[PDB]
Each structure stands twice: as C-alpha cells, then as structure tokens.
Amino acid sequence: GRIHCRLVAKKELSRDVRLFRFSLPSPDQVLGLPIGKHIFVCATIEGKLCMRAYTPTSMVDEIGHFDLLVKVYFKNEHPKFPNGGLMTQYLDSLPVGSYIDVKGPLGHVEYTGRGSFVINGKQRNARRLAMICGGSGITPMYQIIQAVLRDQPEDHTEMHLVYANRTEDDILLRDELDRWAAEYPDRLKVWYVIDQVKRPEEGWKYSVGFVTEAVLREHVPEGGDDTLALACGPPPMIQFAISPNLEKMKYDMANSFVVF
Ligand SMILES: Cc1cc2nc3c(=O)[nH]c(=O)nc-3n(C[C@H](O)[C@H](O)[C@H](O)COP(=O)(O)OP(=O)(O)OC[C@H]3O[C@@H](n4cnc5c(N)ncnc54)[C@H](O)[C@@H]3O)c2cc1C
Numbered sequence: 036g037r038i039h040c041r042l043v044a045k046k047e048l049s050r051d052v053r054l055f056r057f058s059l060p061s062p063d064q065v066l067g068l069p070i071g072k073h074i075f076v077c078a079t080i081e082g083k084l085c086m087r088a089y090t091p092t093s094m095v096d097e098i099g100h101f102d103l104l105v106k107v108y109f110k111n112e113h114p115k116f117p118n119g120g121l122m123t124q125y126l127d128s129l130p131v132g133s134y135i136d137v138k139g140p141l142g143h144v145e146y147t148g149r150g151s152f153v154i155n156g157k158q159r160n161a162r163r164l165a166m167i168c169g170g171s172g173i174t175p176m177y178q179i180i181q182a183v184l185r186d187q188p189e190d191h192t193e194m195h196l197v198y199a200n201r202t203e204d205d206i207l208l209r210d211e212l213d214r215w216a217a218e219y220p221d222r223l224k225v226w227y228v229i230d231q232v233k234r235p236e237e238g239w240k241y242s243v244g245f246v247t248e249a250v251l252r253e254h255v256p257e258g259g260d261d262t263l264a265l266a267c268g269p270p271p272m273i274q275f276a277i278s279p280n281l282e283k284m285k286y287d288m289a290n291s292f293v294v295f
Contacts, residue, residue, distance in 0.1 A: 038066075040135045043100060049204070051107045053127060054092075057135055058100045066091065066101040070182045071152070072142030073175070073295075076103070076135055080125050087122040088141065090174040090295075092208070095182070104207060106171045144265070144293060146179050149190040152263065154293060161263035164192060165255040165286070167246065167277055169199040172267035173207050175295040179265075180212075184219055194223045197254050199246050199268065201230040203239060226254040246272070248280045258286035267295035 039060055046054035059066060068074060073090045093102045107127050108120025129135075145153040150160040166176045176196065183192045200206055206227055216225045228242040228250060242250055256262055264286050266277055273294055282288055 036138065038137045038139075040101075040137055042129055042131050042133045042135060045131055048104075051109060052207075053105050053107060055103045055105060055126065056100050057103070057137070062099045065096060065098055066093075066137075066139075068095070068101075068140055069142075070095065070146040070178055071144035071175075072140040074137045074139035075141060076122070076126070077138055078122065078125055078136065080121060085122050085125070086138070090178050092174060092177065095185075104171070104174060106207070142295075144295065146182055149186065150192045159263065159290075161261055162193060163256040163262045164194045165197075165262065165264040165281070166194060167197040167199075167251070167255060167264070167266045167268070167281075169246075169268035169272050170205070171207065172269070172295065173198060175267045176265065177208050177211070180215070180223060184215060184222060187219065187222065191222060193221075193256070195254060195256050196223065196225050197228065197246060197250060198225065199228040199272070202233050203227075203229055204233055205229070224254070226250070246276045246280070248283060251277075251280045251284055255281070255284065258284045258291070260287070260291070262286065262291070263293070264291055265293045265295065 040057040042055055043058045044056040048054055068091065073088045075086045076089055077084055077086050089103050091101045092104045105123060105126060108123045110119030112119060143155045147153055150162055152159045152161065168176050180194060183190050183194065212225050216223055226241060228246055230244060232239045232243055264281055266273055278288065281292065286292060
C-alpha cells in the first residue's frame, strides 16, 4: 500500500532524461512489486493530488531503494502541449532530500513465472511474446524482459520487441537491451524504429519512420494462440499503428492483446 520514500539521488542521463533513486523507509526491504505491475507516485501539485504510473527499472531484488527512469516533459517544447508535463516537471523540481508517496501494487498483468501470466484474474501462458512499445512505454516491458532472462535458462520464453521512437538519441534502455540481445539471442529479439535519423552518417541499420505492417510482419511473431502480445505506447499509436496490424497478423485481440 502507501509507502513514504525519500529521493536519495538524481541523474541526468540526457537533457530530458533523469534517473531518480528513491529509498524505502525500511533499509532491509525490497519494493515487492510483482512483475507486470506498477506503482503510483502520488503528489499534490498546486491544488490537486496527481497520480501517475511508473514501472521501476531496478532489479526485483534491489534492497533498500528503487529507481525510476523518467522522461521529462518540459514546458516550451511542444506545439500542442506548450506548458509541458505536470508530474515530470514536479519531480525534476524536487531537490534531493525530498519525500515522495508511492501507492502500489497496481495493475492487472502479472508474470508469475515461466510463460505463465495472470491477466485480469484469468491465468494464461505464452511461448512467444510480442512486445511493441514507444517511448517510456518500455519500462513495463523491460521488467518482464529482466524477469525472464533472470530465470534463465529454465524460463525460456521467447520475446520479440519492436521499440519505436523519434530519434536514436531517444532510445531509452538501449545499451541494456543491446547488451542482453547479444547474450540471449534465443530468448530476445530487439528491433528499433525511429521517426528521424539525427546522425545518419554513423549508419542507422534498423527501420526509419513509424511502425508499419511490414515491420510487424517481420519482427513480431505470428499470431494465433500461445503467442501473447503486450503493448504500451501513446494512445494514437496503440490505435492506428498497432491493433489493426496485429489483427491483420491474426492475433486474437481479446484473449491475446494487452496494453499497459
Ligand atoms: C504502466 C505505466 C508505466 C509507465 N512507466 C513510466 C516509466 O517507467 N517512466 C516514465 O518516464 N514514464 C512512464 N509512464 C508514463 C506516466 O504515466 C506519465 O504519463 C508520464 O510521466 C508523463 O506524466 P506527466 O504528469 O509529466 O504528464 P501529463 O501532464 O499527464 O501530460 C502528458 C501529455 O502531454 C504531452 N506533453 C507535454 N509536454 C510534452 C513535451 N515537452 N514533449 C512531448 N510531449 C509532451 C505528452 O506528450 C502527453 O501526451 C508509464 C505509464 C504507465 C501506464
């Protein structure tokens, strides 16, 4: 349930990317966040208590603190969202030493073990996972990815990740993903897509643009049953760019398609 965490440290991974390390009040504990679930960092900004979901990037076994990879939505940055992000600017504003209120565990998805899943109460299993995401929608996915690989080589669940962004300077857990991809070729397949190539000179070898059926066709596995699909991305993307294409790839939308 509710827990009071102090912001122990902050890290600027890039102009708009921070890594915040929060301490739990009892230094001998882990944040027992079951895989597939998130926490709410609650805070009262101005006059309302804001509630935002975040899925930590730290090991399930991390004693004493948990980390959040937060993509800061600054103001004076977007045509349509001129005043930036609420909670993200609030957290970026916090000086280290400050207190935060985490509510958890929330969620409907849980990765109980080996291919096994617990969605909205029901229990299921999968052998091939189709993880399609965009931006920070990667953290929920990176939690399962870390779980499966941790349970290696017994939990040999097959993962196919399609990670979409806008720039190569925007791929979040890149090195981590590249690093794993090299180690567990059999387990995880990684494919990036990017709206633009900031430094094409260096030679971008993945897809350029948006998520297309041609991309899903060659990077997500075949639909059917025993092939689960999980997706966490902005509304329009889940919308236009994903569900129809996966429908076209014969994935039962109901019993086989989930969004975080
Ligand atoms: C399961 C789950 C896990 C999540 N995990 C994480 C996580 O691990 N890490 C993480 O960082 N995020 C995560 N999120 C995202 C989180 O829900 C927030 O919505 C995100 O923090 C932004 O919140 P905010 O209060 O700053 O924005 P809000 O004030 O709610 O506004 C968001 C909207 O404004 C737009 N916007 C405003 N300014 C800009 C700008 N400068 N550039 C681009 N768009 C702009 C955004 O595009 C978005 O459409 C997760 C969400 C869920 C559902």
